[PDB]
Design a protein around this ligand. Structure first.
Ligand SMILES: [Ca+2]
Ligand SMILES: [Ca+2]
Ligand SMILES: [Ca+2]
Ligand SMILES: [Ca+2]
Lengths: 87, 88
C-alpha cells in the first residue's frame, strides 16, 4: 500500500546512511550528521549548525553507546513527522 | 528530499483517512479502522479482525477522548516502522 511504501522508504533511507561506516545497522555520529543535513534540511531549523546536530544525536542516543540504532532512530522520525505535520 | 517526501506522505495519508468524519485532523475509531485495514494489512497480522482493531485503538488513544490525534498516530507509525525494518 502507499503507507507501506512510505514506511519502507524511511527504512531504506536509514540504511542508505547506516551501512556507510562501522556497523551496518546503526548510525554513527558522522552518518547521522550526513542524514540530518542532507535529508532534513527543510524540516528542522538550523540543522546545518554543529550544536544542533550534536544535541539531536545526544537526544537520540538513549543508551549512550555512540550509535543510533533503528529503535532510537524511530524517535527522530517522530520529531520529523511532528514538524512535517505543522507545515 | 526523498525522506521529506515520505514524511509528507505519511501526513497526507493520515489526513486521507482523518478528513472523512468529524474533526479533519483526528481519527475516529471508524477512520482508524479504515486506515489500518486499507493501509496496513501487509504489516500488522490479522488486521481485519475486530478485536485486533479495537485494541490498537485503545492502545493509541492514550488520553481516552475517543479520537487518535496525530501525535498519538505517531505511535502507530513506530509500530509499523519496526515491522518493516525487521531483518529476516
Ligand atoms: Ca553505520
Ligand atoms: Ca545508542
Ligand atoms: Ca476525522
Ligand atoms: Ca486521543
Amino acid at each position: 500500500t502507499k503507507l507501506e511504501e512510505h514506511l519502507e522508504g524511511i527504512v531504506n533511507i536509514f540504511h542508505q546512511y547506516s551501512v556507510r561506516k562501522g556497523h551496518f545497522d546503526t548510525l554513527s555520529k558522522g552518518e547521522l550528521k550526513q542524514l540530518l543535513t542532507k535529508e532534513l534540511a527543510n524540516t528542522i531549523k538550523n540543522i546545518k549548525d554543529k550544536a544542533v546536530i550534536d544535541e539531536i544525536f545526544q537526544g537520540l542516543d538513549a543508551n549512550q553507546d555512540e550509535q543510533v540504532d533503528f529503535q532510537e532512530f524511530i524517535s527522530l522520525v517522530a520529531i520529523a513527522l511532528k514538524a512535517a505535520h505543522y507545515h
